[PDB]
Amino acid sequence: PNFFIDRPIFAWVIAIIIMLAGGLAILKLPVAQYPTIAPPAVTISATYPGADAKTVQDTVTQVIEQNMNGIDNLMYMSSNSDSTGTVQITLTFESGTDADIAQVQVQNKLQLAMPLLPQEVQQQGVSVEKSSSSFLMVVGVINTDGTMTQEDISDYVAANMKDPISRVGDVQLFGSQYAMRIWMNPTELTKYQLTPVDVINAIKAQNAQVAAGQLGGTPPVKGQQLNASIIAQTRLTSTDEFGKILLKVNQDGSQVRLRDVAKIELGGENYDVIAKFNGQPASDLGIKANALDTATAIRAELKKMEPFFPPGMKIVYPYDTTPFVKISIHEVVKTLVEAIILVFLVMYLFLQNFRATLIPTIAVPVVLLGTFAVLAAFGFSINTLTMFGMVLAIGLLVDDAIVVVENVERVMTEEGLPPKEATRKSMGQIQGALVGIAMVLSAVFIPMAFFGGSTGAIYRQFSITIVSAMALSVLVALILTPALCATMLKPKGFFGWFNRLFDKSTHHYTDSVGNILRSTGRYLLLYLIIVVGMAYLFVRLPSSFLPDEDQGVFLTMVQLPAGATQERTQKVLDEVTDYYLNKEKANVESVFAVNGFGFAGRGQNTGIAFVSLKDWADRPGEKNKVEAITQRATAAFSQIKDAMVFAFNLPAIVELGTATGFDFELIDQAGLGHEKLTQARNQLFGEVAKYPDLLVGVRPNGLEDTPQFKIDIDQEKAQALGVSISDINTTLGAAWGGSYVNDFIDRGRVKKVYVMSEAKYRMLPDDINDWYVRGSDGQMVPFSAFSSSRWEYGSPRLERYNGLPSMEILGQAAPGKSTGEAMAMMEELASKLPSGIGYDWTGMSYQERLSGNQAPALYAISLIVVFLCLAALYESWSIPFSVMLVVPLGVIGALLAATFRGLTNDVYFQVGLLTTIGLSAKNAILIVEFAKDLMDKEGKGLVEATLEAVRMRLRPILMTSLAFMLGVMPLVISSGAGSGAQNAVGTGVLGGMVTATVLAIFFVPVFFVVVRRRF
């Protein structure tokens, strides 16, 4: 309005205020390369020392799966069961809910079922926690001295850091804590006729701590004048003085002390997990609100102890992402900077007035700040993509300002109107046009919130960003612009030539237009031909979900055959470290190799290797680039190999994996039995490999049967010999498996006690015979007495899906094939199989199929609402249609690019499409808005009004367009870190806009012409 044509500063102040607010935003908000994107998933952990997967499923898990019931938004419930007595159970809860609450919903249940359970486990640990696979980061620690061991490290740590640290979704500690370990000598127990049972018991007794009452505490006596507390034993505090743990005394008189018949050692709480950083032994932490603050408070909690470390105690940040992120963000900001400073001069071109250009110079930043303050009002996680949203906001931000600029400029110079009335005339013209364009453009991005999914939220954030940005841009366009002009604007040979040439060219081209408008059929047909090629492209699409880029690290798994060791594992893992360090040294900065932690649960035949790399400024070799490195290492690890080795990159999202892929999950409905499930499953592998035209990479994520060694016990003779079957089982377990006897103390820290057989006696079938047992009467006896032994094959893995023994199938559809038709193939093959066999999909292969294929609804709805705003501006049923025909034009321009260059589809792509769409609209909008009134209220010739409108306005349509174009260019120009997404974005919008803008100038007129002459 002109409320501000009373008052220059009132709006100056509004604006300074709003920018100040956006500035307030800078600090109080989050920072991340990505927002919260996954649904909230919960996990349960359970432990049973020394047994089978089948064992627990039949003892522990199956219970839980039975007695869970009544839990909100319970999407689904998967469960693993491994043969190290470990269970991880994952329940995903429907999107947009509260972990903090369902965690409890679930823990109450986990506690319904506990007493059903053992005392071993019930006492060991039964934990509830939350899902996070992608480790926020990692830390490693090595002994530079190279003199001590990993358990030393881990013990130090736990005594020092982990608890301070945990006060953060998860902390994981590879290794274990100092726990005392009683390595049992069986031979000498036989000598002295002892089953370990006596050992366990004597230990339970000689290591404890008990009440002592007090002296005269509660009711005293008359004249009593003293009170104190008594104290009994404590927990024995040394291996040495467990050596003193007395059992027995010989009849001769000699006693029986423990130390003489076993190794009393410090060792692992367990260790089926080992680490070596650059090959040198070390230990670690996997660490997981906020990203940067997290990192920095962590570095702080670290520094304190940094000087307090023992000698040869060095840290490492082997697996990290933060600096990557910051660098990406910083340069993506340099982007904005350069894009704006371009405009700074693009004005000077057609204005040449050091203050003809400053209103735009000024406004934009204020608007970006308004967007900051938007997300401030609503939080919404300042982060990368929501920042790209700022990038694309630019030209929208730009247009209306450029517009008013040239409007007033022409009104004054073309005619000689003082600033006030010149401007207010421009306004009497253009007031509502801008409202129109804004309401239009919003019709594109608004409809996306009602679109659901993790992508649902991606679109929510990016689009609401875009749209609020436009809102504020408009508002200011309608506030301060009107006065700035009459605030600094009074009523070359390096550019004079250019103005000359511009004037010549505009006349040449408008003349070509006057010539061609007479011809319509040919160019009319060309429009449709363009549409057809557009559809040809829309069908020739490659397709994806998101890209992945160098992040300073990557990974490689290692799988050995059934039957394995830490040793045959670690030898190979060492060959790997050797390769990476020796042949590709220049980029291989370090390595964090591991032994034990598999990717399909945990085990022995599994290993994982993290790879850390050099700086972005010293890794320019495209040949020795990230993915080519992996490529060539693969061949290196597919040649002289006797074990499977995937070697590859890190998908840069929290466990979403291949989106063109799928993960089928087969289930035994009705008591068919594990064996039949396996049979039909391998059978289906063999049967489905028949169609390598739709279905590719069909491997099971589960693992195969394995030699299980059974020891059958003949109850009869056991009873016959005065024996406790319990004594049998207990000797067995305490020797071979382990046992949580009790606790002891060290440095105010309690710690565990295990009593397990010495190593070299507990490793082989024949070793069994070395074991004896004390019958009732008292005489040591072998297992050979009553023990049968044999072999078979059973699985070490057992998975279940919501109640039921289930198996997994990792697969992918052909690239030019949706995952849906692959689901059709899978159902066709499997549903044809015997009764009792059901199935389901999951994860991606579930999520993306429950809601997919709605984006067309977005675009139809936007189309509609835009038609509406059009007729609103026009009160014309007929006119709107014309301008909508502008949609397709920019489209091809982007589409063709994806083939003109090696680029593909994603979110970014849909987004740039919608963007260029709204932009072409904006362009034609004000063109026609002019021409119409220029006809009606000037009574001009319809065609003549078109020509007048285009002539009076040709320079800015060029200006703003090309300006946004040049602002976007650098990305496509830009390479290096992050350049993946950067270029992916910069490409499509240029491609589309070039076409849209270079072409509308000839057909907007024709569209309107034919609309009017056929109506």
Numbering used by the authors: 2 to 168, 172 to 292, 297 to 499, 510 to 1033
Publication excerpt:
In vivo AcrB forms a complex with the outer membrane factor (OMF) TolC and the periplasmic adaptor protein (PAP) AcrA, forming a functional tripartite complex with a 3:6:3 stoichiometry respectively, that spans both the inner and outer membrane.
Here, we report the first structure of the Salmonella AcrB transporter carrying the clinically relevant G288D mutation, solved by cryogenic electron microscopy (cryo-EM). STmAcrBG288D structure was determined by single particle cryo-EM to a global resolution of 4.6 Å. Furthermore, to minimise structural artefacts we decided to pursue the determination of STmAcrB in a native-like membrane environment, by utilizing styrene maleic acid (SMA) copolymer for membrane extraction and direct solubilisation of the protein from bacterial membranes. As expected, based on the high sequence similarity, the overall architecture when processed in C3 symmetry is similar to that of E. coli AcrB and the functional biological unit of the protein is formed by three protomers displaying overall 3-fold symmetry. The overall structure of STmAcrB is closely related to that of the previously reported E. coli orthologue, which is consistent with the high level of sequence conservation between the two transporters. However, analysis of the novel cryo-EM structure reveals that the G288D mutation brings D288 in close contact with the well-resolved sidechain of F610. Hence, while there is no-clear density for D288 side chain, there are also no preferred rotamers that could avoid this close contact, suggesting that D288 is either in a less-favoured conformation or maybe in multiple conformations between protomers, explaining the poor density for this region. However, the residues around D288 show a notable shift, which may accommodate the increased bulk and the major change in the electrostatics of the pocket associated with the increased hydration detected in our previous work. Through these changes the lower part of hydrophobic pocket is locally enlarged.
